[PDB]
Design an enzyme around this catalytic site. Sequence first.
Site, PDB file in Angstrom:
ATOM      1  N   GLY A  29      -6.818   3.941  34.087  1.00  0.00           N
ATOM      2  CA  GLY A  29      -6.545   3.095  32.881  1.00  0.00           C
ATOM      3  C   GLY A  29      -8.000   2.844  32.687  1.00  0.00           C
ATOM      4  O   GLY A  29      -8.249   1.612  32.150  1.00  0.00           O
ATOM      5  N   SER A 161      -1.384  -7.637  41.539  1.00  0.00           N
ATOM      6  CA  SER A 161      -1.420  -8.904  40.666  1.00  0.00           C
ATOM      7  C   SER A 161      -0.939  -9.994  41.456  1.00  0.00           C
ATOM      8  O   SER A 161      -0.171 -10.112  42.313  1.00  0.00           O
ATOM      9  CB  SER A 161      -0.623  -8.747  39.475  1.00  0.00           C
ATOM     10  OG  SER A 161      -0.514  -9.865  38.818  1.00  0.00           O
ATOM     11  N   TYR A 175       6.990  -5.420  35.999  1.00  0.00           N
ATOM     12  CA  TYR A 175       5.695  -6.079  36.483  1.00  0.00           C
ATOM     13  C   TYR A 175       5.603  -6.594  37.718  1.00  0.00           C
ATOM     14  O   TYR A 175       4.751  -5.872  38.822  1.00  0.00           O
ATOM     15  CB  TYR A 175       4.762  -6.686  35.420  1.00  0.00           C
ATOM     16  CG  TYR A 175       3.405  -6.726  35.705  1.00  0.00           C
ATOM     17  CD1 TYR A 175       2.457  -5.708  34.964  1.00  0.00           C
ATOM     18  CD2 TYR A 175       2.827  -7.721  36.360  1.00  0.00           C
ATOM     19  CE1 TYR A 175       1.118  -5.684  35.252  1.00  0.00           C
ATOM     20  CE2 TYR A 175       1.458  -7.964  36.694  1.00  0.00           C
ATOM     21  CZ  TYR A 175       0.738  -6.843  35.951  1.00  0.00           C
ATOM     22  OH  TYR A 175      -0.807  -7.086  36.258  1.00  0.00           O
ATOM     23  N   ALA A 176       6.426  -7.496  38.170  1.00  0.00           N
ATOM     24  CA  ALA A 176       6.252  -8.144  39.397  1.00  0.00           C
ATOM     25  C   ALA A 176       6.580  -7.169  40.542  1.00  0.00           C
ATOM     26  O   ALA A 176       6.126  -7.217  41.596  1.00  0.00           O
ATOM     27  CB  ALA A 176       7.067  -9.297  39.503  1.00  0.00           C
ATOM     28  N   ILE A 208      -7.275 -12.531  33.310  1.00  0.00           N
ATOM     29  CA  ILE A 208      -8.651 -11.743  33.206  1.00  0.00           C
ATOM     30  C   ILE A 208      -8.747 -11.715  31.641  1.00  0.00           C
ATOM     31  O   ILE A 208      -7.865 -11.288  30.900  1.00  0.00           O
ATOM     32  CB  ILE A 208      -8.781 -10.503  33.837  1.00  0.00           C
ATOM     33  CG1 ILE A 208      -8.427 -10.603  35.383  1.00  0.00           C
ATOM     34  CG2 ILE A 208     -10.113  -9.943  33.524  1.00  0.00           C
ATOM     35  CD1 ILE A 208      -9.332 -11.539  36.243  1.00  0.00           C
TER      36      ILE A 208
END
Length: 268
Positions: A29, A161, A175-176, A208
Amino acid sequence: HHHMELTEITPESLRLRPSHKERNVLITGAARGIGRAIAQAFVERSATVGICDLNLADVARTCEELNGLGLGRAVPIACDVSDYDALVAAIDDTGLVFDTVVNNAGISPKHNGVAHKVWEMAPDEWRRVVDVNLTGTFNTIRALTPGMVEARRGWIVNTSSVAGKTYSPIVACHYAATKSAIIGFTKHLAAELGPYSIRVNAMAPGRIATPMVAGVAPEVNAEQVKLTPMARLGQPAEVADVALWLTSTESSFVTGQTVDVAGGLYMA
């Protein structure tokens, strides 16, 4: 919409110390955002960096940008990290042996700016996020660990995260789940690879200030900042500093850890 100024400024002579000279570091990424900041930091520390991302022109642009600093060198690695064979081929074409990987690639799809709830979630979207966020991280590790084991040397940093540890209403369930996966994956890997003197850690960023984040409605960032004890968004360079440290000689007995980079947001 105020936020706290940065308070802790690393002097240039220390920021540019050659801590990672003679290191070859693969970053996924890495064309933009946090991944690009991580790449910048490693180049600043005299590492050779593999800029791994999807689009060759985008990757080559970021390589040019990094190589203009006149410190470490950046090389392009254009591929979909979820495609193991494509990843291996792209790595092989650099001619580099990577002793370090920072898995930063991740996606967090939205619909009209909001996450789909689980009862709304398309299976195909779930599967794509799993492929990139989780399987992409496996893929680099599978590609590079045979060499690290042979060398009895290596460093891995994965990206979780805060949303993998507790609920953030900003993200969807894929995502979680994928970011939660990284935590125990990292411990397991640390145990498998530790006998060979390889260290494996993870970072769990909070909120961020990347272009995607900073560009949301002021209200949404404002709420997130209100939830953050340190009273500001994190900077990409602050995530990068953690990746540097976790791959440096000054974390030499630290392995299996997931370190949040979050200013107190969503502690768990």
